[PDB]
């Protein structure tokens, strides 16, 4: 409702895009023209690759942020990494944690790290 | 009102809306990832491992959170996590720093205060 709209607004301000350029993921949603996509289950947003044609619909979105659509596929985690769009997880190496996306960072006493291996 | 704010805060830290708690005397801190001070209108990631049943006592203007199990400087924690607020103005304009995670912009970059607040 307004809940969707205000969240789209919070997401847009975060990425610096227009409210309308934010799309929630749902099996079948038309992805064309959108700049950012939001996963309501994990509650994470990711910039979308530029160039997605209109008519291209969403198929699935994993917890590793892999997006499959009708025209292809794209690792949104990798894309976020290239764009320095990161999520600094709660806690640290000392506390322990669990990483699910390439754009997640874990804090160590000498700085942050991201996992480039199996997720 | 509060709900749309938890939304903005959550999207900033990359957490769930339900993982954001507003500070108030007695508020239960268990499981929350980000705390929000309504007075100063500042948000801070919470230390991990706060037991259920741990309630908030006080939250100073320097972001020092005191709870039933002890206390933690949210400013220092924020610095450790590189979570900063860049104050308006600069050294030229002058300003007042209240928290360890506040940055003041100079001609050659930003600085944080590591002394008496």
From TrEMBL, chain B:
Zn(2+) binds at residue 12. The gene is orf210. It comes from Escherichia phage Cba120. Residues 78-117 form the Tail spike TSP1/Gp66 N-terminal domain. This is Tailspike protein. It is found in: Virion. It comes from the Viruses.
């Amino acid at each position: 409702s307004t809940g969707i709209l205000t969240n789209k607004q919070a997401v847009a301000r975060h990425f610096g895009v227009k409210q309308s350029e934010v799309v929630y993921f749902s099996v079948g949603v038309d992805l064309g023209g959108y700049k950012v996509i939001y996963d309501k289950e994990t509650q994470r947003a990711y910039s979308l690759p530029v160039g997605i044609a209109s008519g291209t619909t969403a198929v699935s979105l994993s917890t590793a942020a892999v997006l499959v659509h009708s025209a292809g596929s794209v690792d949104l985690g990798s894309l976020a990494v290239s764009r320095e769009e990161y999520v600094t997880l709660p806690g640290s190496f000392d506390s322990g944690s669990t990483l699910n996306v390439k754009n997640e960072l874990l804090t160590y006493t000498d700085g942050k790290y991201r996992w480039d291996g199996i997720l």
